[PDB]
Symmetry: D2
Subunit: 455 residues, 4 copies
């Protein structure tokens, strides 16, 4: 079953519908790197679900009531009581987006030499942990590393790995547990409530803190409602509130599940840490009552978080992504499984098995997808992994994928069909996809501006 | 066959359905007239494509640059030159919507006792004609009155009927020819360029004026591009400009094909009529420099008329309607054919063969659709046709229909599937729909607020 | 005393600040007719207070929540309950602006041959009365015709004139009393509560209806609060509610005191007339639940009417106009007295006493004002009176004025100083102002497009 | 002397004052720190000109055309080319506001142990310098530290101090010169073009880099046009472009002179520094293609920076501030002189001569202003100066001031009169203001959330 959109269209965004021949010229002018395409040349932009969401009429009404005061804005108090109501944490500090909150948390909660352990990681999150002296430890269940394995709650932490870390390093040497919902690196996989409670139980017995990386916590809550036994009579809001009852705080990117184009925040329960967070936010972000956001954006984020609690909205959000994954799977196209909350990942290693990883199959597949459909997708393979600048060799990731990342409330099932139909057509003559080589490679951040040409 | 939306969703609004028990209460509280239901109590609102359209980001940017000056507004100058460029008429008078422009035309162009001849009637148009003393003559071809007959360009005027009217009544007794594009009450049926040419040549030879109802002229232009030999490679804008070259002026409801929520205008080439038009607009609408519109709405209408010329936009608009009709026809649901530009018309005579037209089956079917589905649709049969102003009897149209009217850029194919799947289910107990009778009948335009009860 | 603005600026409208030499070229290109100037060439636009108001952040939030449904819009229900609460009438029909409501009222309430009597008149209001067969009778107090006489509540109806009309024509032959608040033709003069009650008392004894032309009823209520003994402890809302308790209905232009750029409505208490109004509004305006307005505009007008009830807003509105009048009066510049609620009228006959009325002193003064300051003002003298087309002679009004009409919440006291300082400078060498002659004069609506040159 | 607003009011927001009894409660609940008061409880909010500006209609039209794409946004390209055109720097990295750009510059450009030398300190700037290991050296001329001394271009660097620092420490030990325009904590004092030239020539001869704090560069350009010989006929844009020609890069808070509510950026000419800057921005702000800003805010900032170049706009901006200072000085109120570009600084040492600086008279005066007036103002003295990081004692600035900071395009001269009239009244019982002491002191940037109590 795939539900209809539980909303109608209030206003549209113009696009140009340039045809295939012209798309090829734009792809060549971008050096076959979709990160270099101009937004104005793109019909369906699946580069990311971050900050690309469509807001509602109610959010846009809030955008006209921005109280732009430097301190004490009504919009901050609205955001504050909304997050306190829906997440249940005592204190909240706004930040301009998620990595601003991570900066603060890692400076507040880490002593050099300590460990942070998590269910895999995200690049900014782990950077701020390591920048502040922590050693990262993956404690996700082994199954999460098998990208073909179709099992539920693949994001769950292996409690035995957590126990082993505690035994070998000592509780006083673990800064905190970083529990992400959902788990990005595994393809957007959810964590069960049973797992969040077991982790809270174990850590609490040793005095260890747990902070959630909560950026897709609403997609996560929908998976719990759909698939965890006993939650079929619970509302999304009830599930979200219980999830965070097992954390000491969180970092949140409103740009994902709060349905906004900018915004984030930091939550915590501890008064002392809250006091310290207020001393630090002024350094990097702004006042404890705006945190690097315009008043109108704290307002849009307060309204959007509350909209995200509607069951039909998040059911349709997740099932629209599933529709795309299901259609590709039915045609035999290789994808990471199960499909996650926010994106479908094509397995470009298998899609282009006539190409070596040194010929950048994910990068080339993403270029072909744009030329054939006007769809932009993100390379998430060897190019994005970067190069070891000590040795000069590529970092070679096991996952060589193209990410079809779906913004919330922007596209329809007919756009999903455009995407799927083009990919399926490509797959039917996949052996024609050509390898790529660098013709310009910057020293750092190479996925952003590198240019290629066909081998 | 069915293209995806040639735009993205920029902002949304929520939709909801109240339980069947509650819809039943709402429907009897509205006296079984869909026009009397409240917006909140509706899930997918197909009452009309008039004024319900979704605007684009460019239009909303224009809405922030409303120049609200009483005379000399930049927005007026933009609307004026846009209409002069795209329609080719010498002079433009804005009005707050289409029936304001009809009020002006009918007062300017009709001497009492004269005839006005058009391709089928429309409710407000015919009222303003008769209120100023004209007799309406229907000169559409006979086929346009038979719902099931699938022929192209059903909106065309019968040149033999036009010729007969001239011979029997004399050209000086004909105030003007009223040529509507598309023809709404025939089901949204288009008029060919050949027919517009032939009507221009015959009327010009007798000195008779021709005024167009331009309200859905862009839908009409699409049908010409798609189906009239020789126009396959002309742009929508070129087709529109050539259409109006066969006319002396037009009335326009911008609330339809100009993609706005309010607005209309009157165009003419004649200098003396324009002078008279400016005198009269002041009485009813406003100064000729804004015509009962805010500046920002003149701007939105100027921008939207030009957006409507985009081929992919209007192809998708029309094919989305066609999709709904195709799905209903594939299931045996009786509809007006061919599907028109803006709506699917269910054939109430066949949905409700157990009822005579004096039991108002179209009014009754629209009520039942709301109760079982929460979808709102409009009566388009004997109730809308009004009464003969000489005999006091119902006008008795052969087309007794219920209109599923599609606002532009608001809904998706998934919403069309919800509508279609629901009507297909109602079709399978069509015998349950009861006949209706008046308990309150207005003295004119009675369909708007009439109240009925079951027989 | 002159209060500070009881609001701050949320957003600004760009203007060009072209200098004097360039303003002279624009005035010449406009044929020395300020009605022909382009809005983009004007610094301070005092042509009219109609539809030119600045909205609040709350209104603009409402503009993002337009429910554009054809029937049953939430925005209509908001407008409806707001007007019922604040004005106290039983029924309300929206119209696109005031003259739409006048059209409806005059068709509903007049039998040909009857009289309508009022405290002077407004052009659209009287047109719709006469178009429907009424003979207009001025029953304003004689003082209102003395433009130099500085007395309170100059808009009051002479009860003895009303009594005389009843005695001479008979009550059954009077369609209604049209009581305007404030009185435009006398310069914006208020009516006392004592007068509204005496008129209600007298008419009610004869079964005669009273309908208010309520377009500046809030300015009127402020004058009652400031100057009528016994109302110093009443809120503006309490005064407004009591005012309308003495009418059977009203016509309202939201474009004036409801702080919007478009919108109006018709109110009445009688069920039968309400039913008849709903039958007629569909003819000219739209549905009883939108009346020729987008949903967002019914919303903005509902919010704005309520904002207009704030005492500090309307005190500042009226006292900003008074500031302008007081400053001019102190320099000896001749104005209509007392200054009204919405505009200052310069007496161009006295300002330019070296010019005959046939040399259009008001028209010329308005041209000089624009050249010296970038301020546009309206000619309200012989040109606007038009020409007797039977005899060819000018209509020669006693008042030969330039109207400095002040939009609500748009300008500051420093803009008022620009206006006053420029006029005072002109007055100090008033003998240099040259007479004007026609070089193009249209047959009708001559103030709108006539062009002049210096004698 | 004082020009009127070179714009009209497009939309408003309401202002209100709570009773003195309630302001007293609010002030003690905020621990006598103005930063802790709530926006709703303030009547005229002069806490800061940062992020509080009113945007124009053109900017708000841009806000409807946010291109929210992660890379390649039209809004990014517009901001980039606007800054390249107007400032002349080769490369731009957007940041969410100014201290994000300072974070990046200080990490890129400082080796631990090096010196950074600037024209007076600023709070966040100096924190990022010292946090990355630099020692701050103040090389402004001595006069900038004496509040009462009325001399032009008080912001100028003392070239003798710069020369001395080079000789005593060696150019390789100076990380860069930090030249701020205007100089905020000297009272908004401008820097001359001659001084920017001379600093460029001396630093270039030793290979020392110069980075500007551009936050109020347009105010600065106005002072140059008004007061520096030879610039009287140069445009504001020409002056701005020449200023930045003497710099190697800049940090910008667009929240000041770019007329927006959020936004900033980092500019530089060096290719390698730009590459490093892009690596680092990802960690803290976002991708280099949006830098922690929504697309619509990049657009608003591109539009606003160009609006700021309008002469009449910035003349009025500065002269409105000057008006407030002139009125206060005419009454004997002690202020920093000359009045700067963005604010009037009351001299707390003279308003509160009965207090020593250890009793925090500036913090105390800001509290009392709120209680007696409801106007919010900011502490700018010993509390903001922080503590010496080697000795632990207060930094002891000669300037102990309370800032009346004027947001751009928000208030009127009538609002300035309200502020001035209120401060003049407080001046006449200045002896009543009590001394303060810390009850809560943050470890850095303590002024933001410090809590005090009366001594
Ligand atoms: C209201 C409808 N149509 C309006 C209309 C009108 C009247 O336009 P306004 O609704 O803008 O007055 C004139 N001519 C045609 C062919 C029309 O379809 C409708 O069909 O729902
Ligand atoms: C917050 C203020 N100023 C910020 C500022 C900053 C920091 O900018 P952000 O507030 O955008 O971080 C940098 N440099 C100067 C000269 C500044 O004035 C203020 O003065 O109120
Ligand atoms: K974004
Ligand atoms: K509408
Ligand atoms: K207007
Ligand atoms: K702000």
């Amino acid at each position: 079953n795939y539900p209809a959109e539980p909303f109608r269209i209030k206003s549209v965004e113009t696009v140009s519908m340039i045809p295939r021949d012209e798309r090829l010229k734009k792809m060549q002018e971008a050096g076959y790197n979709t990160f270099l395409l101009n937004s104005k040349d793109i019909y369906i932009d699946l580069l990311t679900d971050s900050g690309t969401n469509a807001m509602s009429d109610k959010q846009w009404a809030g955008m006209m009531m921005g109280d732009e005061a430097y301190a004490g804005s009504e919009n901050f108090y609205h955001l504050e009581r909304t997050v306190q109501e829906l997440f249940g944490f005592k204190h909240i500090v706004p930040t301009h987006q998620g990595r601003g909150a991570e900066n603060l948390l890692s400076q507040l909660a880490i002593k050099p030499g300590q460990y942070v352990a998590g269910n895999m990681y995200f690049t900014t999150t782990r950077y701020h942990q390591e920048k502040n002296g922590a050693v990262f430890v993956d404690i996700v269940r082994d199954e999460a590393h098998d990208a073909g394995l179709n099992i539920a709650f693949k994001g769950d932490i292996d409690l035995k790995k957590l126990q082993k870390l505690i035994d070998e390093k000592g509780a006083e040497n673990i800064a905190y547990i970083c529990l992400a919902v959902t788990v990005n690196l595994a393809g957007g996989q959810p964590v069960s409530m049973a797992n969040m409670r077991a982790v809270r139980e174990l850590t609490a017995a040793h005095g260890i803190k747990v902070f959630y990386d909560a950026t897709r916590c609403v997609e996560n809550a929908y998976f719990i409602k759909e698939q965890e036994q006993g939650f079929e009579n619970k509302s999304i809001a009830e599930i979200v509130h219980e999830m965070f009852s097992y954390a000491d705080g969180c970092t949140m990117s409103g740009k994902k599940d709060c349905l906004v184009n900018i915004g984030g925040f930091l939550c915590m329960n501890d008064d002392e840490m809250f006091s310290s967070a207020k001393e630090l936010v002024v350094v990097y972000e702004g006042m404890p009552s705006y945190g690097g956001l315009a008043g109108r954006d704290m307002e849009a984020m307060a309204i959007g978080l509350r909209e995200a609690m509607q069951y039909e909205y998040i059911e349709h959000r997740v099932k629209q992504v599933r529709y795309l994954g299901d259609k590709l799977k039915a045609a035999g196209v290789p994808i990471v499984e199960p499909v996650g909350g926010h994106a479908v990942f094509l397995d470009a290693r298998r899609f282009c098995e006539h190409l070596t990883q040194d010929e950048f199959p994910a990068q080339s597949l993403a270029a072909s997808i744009y030329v054939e459909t006007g769809v932009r997708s993100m390379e998430r393979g060897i190019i994005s992994a970067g190069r070891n600048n000590v040795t000069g060799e590529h970092h070679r990731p096991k996952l060589e994928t193209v990410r079809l990342t779906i913004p919330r409330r922007v596209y329809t099932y007919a756009h999903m069909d455009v995407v799927a139909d083009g990919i399926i057509k490509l797959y039917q003559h996949k052996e024609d996809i050509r390898g790529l080589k660098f013709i310009y490679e910057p020293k750092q951040l190479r996925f952003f501006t590198a240019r290629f040409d066909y081998i």
